[PDB]
Assembly symmetry: C2
Homo-oligomer: 312 residues x 2
């Protein structure tokens, strides 16, 4: 009988989009069965975000989400911090293993509200079908100088693989990552942007805590000879060779998002081998996708917003 707002005291600082295209700005005492609701398990309550592979998407995306967006925006220079503790309960059980996005779900992001509307960070959990352990990795998308159709993401592994580890054919998978994270296994992230520098921390009991620093005010990617080999390789059949503006996301307004942003869709892999995953979507029927594994589902027990801080 609980609402998610009973578990997240800053619920009034978020709006939501659900997998069925519902937008809701006032989330105090709000739930909707099968998308955004509370689940009780032994001694903890969790906020569930559940979304199919193909529901009603936002105008900005081909992928379906049930995900919060922070109402108060900020530029990297003034900063912001998001802390989450969560477990992924389910990712799509179908999709083409040659496509980097298949079988994954983004569980936190910074999204830009203007300009190209790209993401300085998207944190993913990806698990191939049949595997016990999945991978957590995070992607930085360039704030492309000029035409955004040449953009790309650079993916960095936390536990397990990064997004570039694909199967060599549509239904054969790499071996499971030995150091990865199971469904139902708790982990935490913090995204702390202080004075334009994004400091990430990822922790999970029994695994190494892993930290990263990425300056969001000065690009590392301002010419062709700076594009990482990972981009040349993973985007080789797409054609993406953009460069990033010199000052990256300096002064660009953005905001946090958190929940289940499903990156497995039913688009044809031939149209985009990195992001169109060709999964089973049952012609958009949400109840049939839910009955056959064609969805993602992520549970959070803590989601806190605060100000950016100097790492100690």
């Amino acid at each position: 009988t609980k609402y998610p707002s009973e578990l997240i005291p800053q619920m009034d600082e978020w709006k939501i989009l659900l997998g069925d295209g519902t937008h809701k700005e006032d989330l105090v005492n709000y739930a909707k069965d099968d998308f955004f609701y509370v689940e009780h398990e032994n001694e903890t309550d969790w906020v569930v975000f559940k979304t199919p592979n193909s529901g009603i998407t936002s105008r900005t995306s081909s992928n379906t989400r049930t995900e919060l967006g922070q109402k108060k925006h900020w530029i990297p220079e003034t900063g912001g911090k998001l802390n989450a503790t969560l477990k992924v309960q389910h990712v799509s059980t179908s999709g083409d293993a040659r496509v980097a996005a298949s079988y994954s779900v983004v569980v936190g992001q910074i999204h830009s509200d203007e300009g190209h509307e790209n993401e300085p960070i998207k944190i993913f959990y990806k698990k191939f079908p049949g595997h016990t352990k999945g991978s957590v990795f995070w992607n930085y998308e360039i704030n492309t100088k000029g035409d955004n159709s040449k953009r790309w993401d650079y993916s960095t592994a936390v536990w397990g693989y990064d997004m570039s580890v694909v199967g060599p054919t549509a239904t054969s998978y790499p071996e499971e990552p030995e150091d990865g994270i199971a469904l139902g296994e708790e982990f935490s992230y913090e995204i702390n942007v202080y004075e334009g520098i994004m400091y990430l921390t990822f922790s999970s009991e029994g695994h190494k805590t892993i930290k990263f620093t990425k300056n969001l005010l000065k690009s590392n990617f301002t010419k062709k000879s700076d594009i990482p080999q990972q981009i040349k390789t993973l985007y080789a059949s797409i054609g993406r060779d953009g460069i990033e503006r010199e000052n990256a996301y300096a002064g660009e307004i953005q905001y946090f998002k958190l929940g289940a942003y499903n990156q497995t869709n039913g688009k044809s892999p031939e149209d985009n081998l990195v992001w169109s995953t060709g999964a089973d979507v049952y012609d958009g029927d949400i109840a049939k996708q839910y009955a056959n594994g064609s969805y993602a589902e992520v549970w959070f027990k803590e989601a806190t917003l605060g100000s950016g801080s100097a790492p100690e």
Copy 2:
């Protein structure tokens, strides 16, 4: 009670500078006698800011302040809202009455953290010696295009006079304003910056609620022919003919301040008849100033920070 943080639940969102030059970042359970403390009166507790006319000033100013500064900064596009209810209990009883800033105290501001470090708004209370009623007015400072030494403030009256109404000699005063606010009389302000537009609301029991709208993204002062007449009298002595850059404070990082920023100092009126007030400051001896009326003291009942909101 004793700590101002028992009255202001958001005390951890502010830092302070006191009139003796003390800076303190963590204000929970913090008070300093004679500067920042709580006074109980009839059935309400108030947070008191008290400052001499000449204490230890910030590097940025010739005036002394005991004043909060908001820790988390913002640009006008993303916005912010400050609400306060207060009463002014004392302004300096000495000063050259010809000088526009004399006998006044700023009780709320937006202050820029970069660039020229100018203020999109400072809210003043000013009361000539011996008057019962003082005036509340607010100043917008241009974000000067080019050299800031040509900057100026434009003052708009709320109740009573604006800053430009001065006495005819150093020691005599204009008539009391018909509509002003007495020492000890409560009034409220709200500075609500939503999508770059500043909406002000001022209210006090038994006076008209007054509202203003000022766009902080698009200057009304881009040509010399737009400089208001007011500036031509006040600033005649001083060389201030600047114009403002076209997009005003767009993208410039700001934050709110609230407290007692005393505008009466001991500087020579013959050097600057707008800001150099020639008051008695007893060689910077704070005790002697407090004993002889050379100070400002403002009590707040409420002080809340929030997001900017669309008016309605």
